[PDB]
Amino acid sequence: LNRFDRDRLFNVVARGNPEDLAGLLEYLRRTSKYLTDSEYTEGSTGKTCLMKAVLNLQDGVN
């Protein structure tokens, strides 16, 4: 797994499609990355992909 962009990750979770997350774990393991690293946050507030997932809810759940 070569790359997973923050922009793509936020877009994936907003749409709420769990299948589009495929490869994220492998990419993180290969690169030893964490979803809380500056790369996966806006920087201006420190907003995570989990916050986005909760901000974008289809009725009750995501």
UniProtKB/TrEMBL annotation:
Q: Where does the source fall among the domains of life?
A: Eukaryota
Q: Spell out the subcellular localization from the entry.
A: Cell membrane
* UniProt-recorded name of the protein: Transient receptor potential cation channel subfamily V member 2
Taxonomic placement: Eukaryota, Metazoa, Chordata, Craniata, Vertebrata
Which gene carries the instructions for this protein? TRPV2
